[PDB]
Amino acid sequence: LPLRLLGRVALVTGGSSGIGESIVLLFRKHGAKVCIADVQDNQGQRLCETLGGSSDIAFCHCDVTIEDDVKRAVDFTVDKFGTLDIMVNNAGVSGPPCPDIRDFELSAFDRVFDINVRGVFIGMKHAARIMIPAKKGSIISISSVASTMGGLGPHAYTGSKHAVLGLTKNVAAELGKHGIRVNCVSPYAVATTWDDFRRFVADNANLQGVELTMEDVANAVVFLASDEARYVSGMNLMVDGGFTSTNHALQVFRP
Amino acid sequence: SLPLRLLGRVALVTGGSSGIGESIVLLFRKHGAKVCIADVQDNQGQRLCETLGGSSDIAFCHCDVTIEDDVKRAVDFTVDKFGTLDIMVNNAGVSGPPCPDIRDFELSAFDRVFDINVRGVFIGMKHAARIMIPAKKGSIISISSVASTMGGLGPHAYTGSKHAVLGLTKNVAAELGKHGIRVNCVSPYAVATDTWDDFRRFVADNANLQGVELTMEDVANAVVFLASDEARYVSGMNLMVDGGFTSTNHALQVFRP
Amino acid sequence: LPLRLLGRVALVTGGSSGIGESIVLLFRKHGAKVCIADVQDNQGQRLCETLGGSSDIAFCHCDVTIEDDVKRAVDFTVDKFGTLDIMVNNAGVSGPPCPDIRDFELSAFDRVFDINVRGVFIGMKHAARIMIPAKKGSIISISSVASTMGGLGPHAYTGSKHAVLGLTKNVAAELGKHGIRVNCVSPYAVDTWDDFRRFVADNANLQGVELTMEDVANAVVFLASDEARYVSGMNLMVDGGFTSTNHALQVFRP
Amino acid sequence: LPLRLLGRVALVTGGSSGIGESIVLLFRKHGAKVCIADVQDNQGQRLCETLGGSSDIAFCHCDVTIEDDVKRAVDFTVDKFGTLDIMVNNAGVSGPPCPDIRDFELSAFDRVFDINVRGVFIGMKHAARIMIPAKKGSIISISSVASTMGGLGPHAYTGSKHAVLGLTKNVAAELGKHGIRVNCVSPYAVATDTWDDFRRFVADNANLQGVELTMEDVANAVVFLASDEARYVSGMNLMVDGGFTSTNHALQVFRP
């Protein structure tokens, strides 16, 4: 059986660390060619040194809040590997916790929407510039459980994660007529006072007995990137173990 | 007979000079409320100001909802006129030009829509909260649209912002529930605010509910409901006024020819 | 200002007690003529004696699990008051708590779907028989928060409440072409009396107010009136934000 | 790289034909052992002769509307292959089209809920009897787009598909504490005079153009939720509708 992504070209924004690093590593294992677009042009190569000088991985410096940067990333990728088949919008931030809305600064608010929403739309816009004439492609954005439910995070974070789902569904509507799939992946809180946050998210988890790892989220992306999701679009794939579809506040099934 | 449904309540309406906001203001006033309009362009702001008359239970404050200090002055003005703030209506909203190809969507156009639709709504929540939290009572209502739940019903920036408003509504409802404050949003179907007849026929043909046309007063009635004590335990709700448009899909012609 | 439901005829299934009793009382305050369809004539009229022997309220005995019973209710209401404008499907049960699915009896399962789903569909079907030629009407079903989220109740209950939402949306699709509105109302939970009262309030999103039966009734009155003349396919939550939020991570609640 | 389901035991209700046949064939390609539970034991083995002879596939006659039948299916599978790791509830019917609710017979209504809802719950109940002491497993039900949107099918069908989603979420809540994943897969209409014309019709109203929804596409979704790549996926309605339910092209914003 061939590798699930053999020959496909992928661009991953924020791939230098965190979930993006997992996605990049998993994509390579399944035969993909991957370009990382991330800030701090030193660190993206610094990660690239760790994984080696493979001729199927490349780094482009890109601030996803600048349209011309993301443009240069896509133009760079198609010049290395000849096309662009997968676009992963992983750049995302949360903002500081704010327990009282009366202390929520609009500057903090503005920054989160600039990165979480504007950055994702720019990625869709320039991936579309390649994928539409090819009549094929797969666009994947990393949302979180805050895309479907309130109270799971700060206001600007929750609003932006909802906005990403709305963009996903609307752009899925426009790009469906060209064969382009748009989807988003919404994870539960992932660890990495360490075992204290690790215990907390596990105690409030619906699914007990396994910990949500970064590789779990990556596996969801790999699915939506491959031809096994060939007819999947406009979908918010939850990797929350059932956290959002349930509520154990009345203690019907949990003590 | 029975008392008026909003008697003695103070309301602030952003964008009340025209359109749906004008209906909300007029309906609120019919049910006994005191209303302050916050709207831009004092030329249009005075335009309605004279239009309604000179009553001592209506007032106008000039406010660009994209400026936090403007909305701050609106709230501070209202509580100085009528003594408190019980209802906050975020009706300022824009759609943007139609754009059929994402490859031609300008980020400046994108930025403007989110500034007004999302940032303006959050600022309204933030400063209404500054009054309503110490009173331990209030009702915040935002005017979304059917684009808050379904894709393809409008441009990208519009659909994203309407989704963002629903997300803010639910999240702020989570924070303000502790204090007895209700946060909800109202999502209308397209309203026809010779080409008028042509758009009017188009939205009616694609409507789920036939034999009636969505008027501005219909949307206002939904707000009046969520503003009153008949919605005393309603919060976090996206009250659709779409006649079933979003909950159904007649593309397979099971029930429509 | 006139009463919000003046001259309107309403049928309420399960209106002898609980939420249905409040819906009936509220409907009458707003000028409606109301027919109650409920079991146990010995009690169905006995409560109808406490309200009084008015000429704008009537009782018909009806097992909502029997199609011919619901049929006679609608035929009775129309013969009393001349038409049928509002149909309220309030008959609903939950079943015993079952903490382990391996002990869930299928007979218990069958009974809940018979009353909660089959009873609601029969109500829609025979209300439709009147409302379609009139080209007007409003059908309202009483769901609960279990219509949108799992874990808030037993399996058969949660499944049936989801089924009611699905029927509501699908029948809204068919009856929209005739001007008929279909909606559903999903309430939050309303010495064990007092200790249940504190428990639902502690886990409530909206604090400082308790969900009363009159609150749910007000939602129905809204969807029954012309103030909702363009509302259809809607699941109106009266849960104070309970289903749209989750305080398990203690972001906003301690 | 090993096969994605190597050593896992799966029970598939309705596996003789349609989507279930593809799920069985795909599961087998990825190393799984499969038991088919389907009515009409005549045809039920006829497929088991169609696919071929194998010591990793088996057939049990089972009416999913009878609890004791499904019970015997699970007890049969565990005795053949030693455990039960995957349970697929594919048995499902739709009922005749009914354009006017005033002509909808309650007998027709009763039959659809008996098979679509009661059959699915029985499958969950008896899969749970095995999977809870093992502290592992994956339960997958085949819903359709009618689980999320009205108007896409008859009333009894749409109600039952909604009920299945509700059961999925609620049972996911109870079985999460044991490590058991419950999910459902909701496909768009699959084609396989009125063949090429129903096929041309669902494609015109599809959001995603240039690709036809095949049965193998739906099977791939199940394989995903059956494997350890969905190890933390539960309570999920995985749409395979190409974006059909998340969009609405009635206003012709993006489609002419």
> Could you give the CA distance from residue A78 to residue A86 in angstroms, rounded to a whole number?
11
Is B254:D152 a contact under the CB 8 Å cutoff? yes
* Nearest partner of D203 among D185, D188, D215, judged by Cα: D188
Query: What is the largest distance, in Å, between two alpha-carbon atoms of chain B?
Result: 60
* DSSP 8-state assignment for residue B2: P
Helix/strand/coil (H, E, C) string of chain A?
CCCCCCCCEEEEECCCCCHHHHHHHHHHHCCCEEEEEECCHHHHHHHHHHHCCCCCEEEEECCCCCHHHHHHHHHHHHHHHCCCCEEEECCCCCCCCCCCHHHCCHHHHHHHHHHHHHHHHHHHHHHHHHHHHHCCEEEEEECCHHHCCECCCCHHHHHHHHHHHHHHHHHHHHHHHHCEEEEEEEECCCCCCHHHHHHHHHHCCCCCCCCCCHHHHHHHHHHHHCHHHCCCCCEEEEECCCCCCECCCCCCCCC
* Nearest partner of D145 among D213, D99, D98, D192, judged by Cα: D213
> Could you give the CA distance from residue C172 to residue C182 in angstroms, rounded to a whole number?
5
Q: Find the CB nearest B249 among D151, D189, D254.
A: D151
What are the chain B neighbours of C177 within 8 Å (beta carbons)?
210, 255-256
* Nearest partner of D122 among D66, D164, D77, judged by Cα: D66
Quick one: chain D helix, strand, coil %, rounded to 5?
Answer: 45, 15, 35
Beta bridge partners of B87: B11, B139
DSSP H helices, D114-186, are 119-134, 155-175
Radius of gyration of chain D (CA): 18
What are the chain A neighbours of B124 within 8 Å (beta carbons)?
none
* Nearest partner of C9 among C155, C136, C95, C141, judged by Cα: C136
Please check whether residue A238 touches D, CB under 8 A.
yes
Angle at A30 between CA A24 and CA A31, to 5 degrees: 90
Query: Do the chains contact at A247 and C153, CB–CB below 8 Å?
Result: no
C129: CB partners within 8 A, 6+ apart: C74, D102
> Could you give the CA distance from residue A221 to residue A26 in angstroms, rounded to a whole number?
9
Query: Residue ranges of the domains in chain D?
Result: 1-256
Q: Which residue has the tokens 């391996």?
A: C102
> Could you give the CA distance from residue B175 to residue A100 in angstroms, rounded to a whole number?
8
Resolution (Å units): 2.0
* DSSP 8-state assignment for residue B248: B
**Parallel/antiparallel/unpaired status of strands A9-13 and D137-142:** unpaired
Is A170:A117 a contact under the CB 8 Å cutoff? no
Which sign, positive or negative, has the C-alpha torsion D148, D153, D154, D160?
Answer: negative
* Nearest partner of D57 among D48, D65, D66, judged by Cα: D48
Encoded tokens for B72: 């701050």
* Nearest partner of D163 among D121, D128, D108, judged by Cα: D121
* DSSP 8-state assignment for residue D103: G
Is D123:D13 a contact under the CB 8 Å cutoff? yes
Is B148:B107 a contact under the CB 8 Å cutoff? no
Please check whether residue D149 touches B, CB under 8 A.
yes
B104: helix, strand or coil: helix
> Could you give the CA distance from residue C38 to residue C60 in angstroms, rounded to a whole number?
7
A126: CB partners within 8 A, 6+ apart: A67, A70, A71, A73, A74
* Nearest partner of D115 among D94, D129, D97, judged by Cα: D94
> Could you give the CA distance from residue B95 to residue B99 in angstroms, rounded to a whole number?
11
Q: At how many degrees (to 10) do helices B107-114 and B156-176 cross?
A: 30
Task: Return the C-alpha torsion angle A44, A130, D246, D173, nearest 10.
Answer: -30
Beta bridge partners of A208: none
Encoded tokens for A4: 């699930």
| Whole-number Cα distances in Å, B249 to A89, A233, B207, B253, D246 | 30, 17, 10, 9, 10
Task: Note the Cα A88 to chain centre separation in Å.
Answer: 6
Angle at B100 between CA B92 and CA B216, to 5 degrees: 35
| B99 to chain D, closest Cα gap in Å | 9
B118: CB partners within 8 A, 6+ apart: A113, A159, A163, B161, B164, B165, B168
Residues 155-214 of D with CB under 8 A from B: 189, 201-202, 205
Q: How crowded is residue A185: how many other Cβ atoms within 10 Å of its Cβ?
A: 26
D129: CB partners within 8 A, 6+ apart: C102, D74
Whether B81 is catalytic is: no
Please check whether residue D108 touches C, CB under 8 A.
no
Encoded tokens for D251: 């206003």
Beta bridge partners of B241: B188
> Could you give the CA distance from residue A255 to residue A248 in angstroms, rounded to a whole number?
9
Query: What is the largest distance, in Å, between two alpha-carbon atoms of chain A?
Result: 57
Interface partners of chain C (CB pairs < 8 Å, 3 or more) are: A, B, D
Which run of H or of E encompasses B225? helix B216-227
Is A147:A120 a contact under the CB 8 Å cutoff? no
> Could you give the CA distance from residue B214 to residue C231 in angstroms, rounded to a whole number?
10
Q: Which residue has the tokens 């886990």?
A: C203
Is A140:A88 a contact under the CB 8 Å cutoff? yes
* Nearest partner of A157 among A143, A169, A168, A167, judged by Cα: A143
What are the chain A neighbours of D221 within 8 Å (beta carbons)?
228-229, 232
Task: Note the Cα B31 to chain centre separation in Å.
Answer: 18
Angle at A79 between CA A74 and CA A84, to 5 degrees: 50
Q: Which residue has the tokens 């302050």?
A: B36
Is C88:C138 a contact under the CB 8 Å cutoff? no
Which residue among the candidates B162, B187, B189, B235 is catalytic per the annotation?
Answer: B162
Q: A169 — phi, psi (to 5°)?
A: -70, -40
**Parallel/antiparallel/unpaired status of strands D86-89 and C86-89:** unpaired
| Whole-number Cα distances in Å, D75 to A7, C147, D69, D70, D84 | 45, 33, 10, 9, 9
Whether A245 is catalytic is: no
Burial of C214 (0-12, 13-18, 19+ CB in 10 A): middle
Burial of C102 (0-12, 13-18, 19+ CB in 10 A): exposed
* DSSP 8-state assignment for residue D176: G
| Residue A137 Rama label (left phi>0; alpha psi -120 to 50; beta) | left
Could you tell me the strand order of the sheet in which D86-89 lies?
Answer: D57-61, D33-38, D9-13, D86-89, D137-142, D180-187, D236-240
| DSSP secondary structure of B140-153 | EEEE--GGGT-BTS
> Could you give the CA distance from residue A195 to residue C68 in angstroms, rounded to a whole number?
63
Encoded tokens for D241: 């509708």
> Could you give the CA distance from residue A106 to residue B50 in angstroms, rounded to a whole number?
34
Encoded tokens for B192: 């026809």
> Could you give the CA distance from residue B137 to residue B86 in angstroms, rounded to a whole number?
7
Is A146:A97 a contact under the CB 8 Å cutoff? no
DSSP H helices, chain D, are 19-29, 41-51, 67-81, 106-113, 119-134, 155-175, 195-204, 215-226
Which residue among the candidates D33, D143, D147, D161 is catalytic per the annotation?
Answer: D161
CA atoms within 13 A on the CB side of A60: 23
Q: Which residue has the tokens 């409440």?
A: C161
Encoded tokens for A140: 């994947």
Which residue among the candidates C143, C144, C147, C232 is catalytic per the annotation?
Answer: C144
Q: D152 — phi, psi (to 5°)?
A: -90, 5
Encoded tokens for B45: 């702001």
Is D138:D228 a contact under the CB 8 Å cutoff? no
Chain discontinuities in chain B, listed by preceding residue (C to N exceeding 2.5 Å): 193
Question: Quick one: how many helices (H) and strands (E) in chain B?
Answer: 8, 7
Contacts 24+ apart (CB under 8 A), C60-67: C60/C35, C60/C36, C61/C37, C62/C13, C62/C37, C62/C38, C63/C39, C64/C13, C64/C14, C64/C37, C64/C89, C64/C91, C64/C115, C64/C119, C64/C122, C64/C123, C65/C114, C65/C115, C65/C118, C65/C119, C67/C122, C67/C125, C67/C126, C67/D106
| Whole-number Cα distances in Å, D100 to B55, C128, C131 | 53, 9, 13
> Could you give the CA distance from residue A73 to residue B233 in angstroms, rounded to a whole number?
50
**Which of A104, A162, A164 has the highest number of chain B CBs within 10 A, making it the mutation to test binding with B?**
A162
> Could you give the CA distance from residue A88 to residue C118 in angstroms, rounded to a whole number?
46
Which run of H or of E encompasses B157? helix B156-176
Residues 129-148 of B with CB under 8 A from D: none
Is C156:C95 a contact under the CB 8 Å cutoff? yes
Beta bridge partners of D140: D88, D183
Q: Which residue has the tokens 């202390």?
A: A103
Please check whether residue C20 touches A, CB under 8 A.
no
Query: Do the chains contact at B225 and C229, CB–CB below 8 Å?
Result: no
Please check whether residue D248 touches B, CB under 8 A.
yes
Q: How crowded is residue C35: how many other Cβ atoms within 10 Å of its Cβ?
A: 25
Helix/strand/coil (H, E, C) string of chain C?
CCCCCCCCEEEEECCCCCHHHHHHHHHHHCCCEEEEEECCHHHHHHHHHHHCCCCCEEEEECCCCCHHHHHHHHHHHHHHHCCCCEEEECCCCCCCCCCCHHHCCHHHHHHHHHHHHHHHHHHHHHHHHHHHHHCCEEEEEECCHHHCCECCCCHHHHHHHHHHHHHHHHHHHHHHHHCEEEEEEEECCCCHHHHHHHHHHHCCCCCCCCCCHHHHHHHHHHHHCHHHCCCCCCEEEECCCCCCECCCCCCCCC
> Could you give the CA distance from residue B239 to residue B187 in angstroms, rounded to a whole number?
6
